[PDB]
Amino acid sequence: MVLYFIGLGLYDERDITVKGLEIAKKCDYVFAEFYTSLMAGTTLGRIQKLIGKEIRVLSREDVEANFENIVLPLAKENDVAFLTPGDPLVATTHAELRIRAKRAGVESYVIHAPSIYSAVGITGLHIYKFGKSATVAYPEGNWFPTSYYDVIKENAERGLHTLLFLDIKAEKRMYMTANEAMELLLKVEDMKKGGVFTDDTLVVVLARAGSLNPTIRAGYVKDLIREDFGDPPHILIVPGKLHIVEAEYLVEIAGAPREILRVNV
Template sequence: MFYLIGLGLGDSKDITIKGLEIIKKCDRVYLEHYTSILTCGIDELEDFYGIKLITADRDLVEQCADEILDGADKGDVALLVVGDPYGATTHTDLILRAKEKNIKFQVVHNASILNAVGCCGLQLYSFGETVSIPFWTEEWKPNSFYDKILSNFERNLHTLCLLDIKVKEPTLESLTKKKKQYMPPRFMSVDIAAQQLIQIINSDRSSSTGLSVNSLCIGLARVGSTCQRIHVCTISEMSKVDLGPPLHSLVIPNPVLHPLEEEYLNQFKS
């Protein structure tokens, strides 16, 4: 059996009882840790689970998925995922591969930022399409996510912005070489996301939605952990805010808040 198990958002104890019971009986347990991160280390997970984990980086999950599934038709193999297993398309691909190999599988769900974003007080059913904000470089500054934010804003829907994570990313120079070299890990913070968003807003002369650098936004940091932080201010002000260590997310609320949403947000304004 192949198990895809969500770990939740905080630390080692966020795993479900069902997930923990499965882990303890598995022959091999992989930990995928490049699409998101926990606030604890791998050592803490191993101590709590009572097993040795196999680190599954991007290359293993995306290019050598069959290695993970090997033997799952005869024994029990699990892949642990931060948040919920279906929070990334990579994990959906693993399920399809298991089906092709006639390997039985089971998914154990957990909390993810897609539902935990409700901690800021915005109503979940008022969220529109989620977007991802990538790191810009001097040569590459994609802004297609901005159109989706505007579309949500025009329809009075909130936007959850997932911020870029760079873990074990090969350098451009090493892509043409036999031996890959990797960039240091990077995690986008809310101030960087706001700075990029400001550049797009200032260059957009066609928008009539009312979204501006003075529009409200919400910075989220380490959601689900004991050191969780929520900060509410304008996009312009957010570009100077330091919410500490990762992971961060940014929310652009719709322009017409429900009175309860507005009241709840007020406690996080500086």
């Protein structure tokens, strides 16, 4: 009689909220997608075990093209759940799926879960200081995406931090590293020459947020562009103007160069 959008969280199967688990356990059918993000600390098997149900994984086409044919039909006579990494409606187009549910006469509910969008708070950067977000997409063919560069520029001149989601090709199992994101940005800088992202730009890297020991590193591009941040997923952040307390955290916790403590008022 209902459809639930349930987030699974950041890293492993235990990142689902208690609410999400108790509800998922009682559903008649459970579907899921794992192409919008990467949960590096678990497996489908462990999720199924925890929920105690067989999970039917859908592909991007199954969802985008046939959600109303594959999932909604069952939701009319049963309690159905749709699982996703992180929070189901963050940096996805899943929100529109609720419209499909309504038109199909199916009531839907949303159960949130930890999202990278807020987990960035672990970098020590004030969340309210984050501006517009963007995604660094893999160039393909003669098409080289550059919009994310402009976002950084706009945020930076307002003194705001920029959160950069990194590209993912789930089927090909390719997860863009912070290193690759930095390389691509230097190329865009060369092309546009706006003085937005260079070897001296301070950046922050967060890898495998949600794990007990995520990698949190801060430093200049010249020094981090070749550093090993561990397995994906990775997120990249270009800080804006720092508050002393932010810099203080980047130094003490993320091992940033102590010179950043000296902020130019």
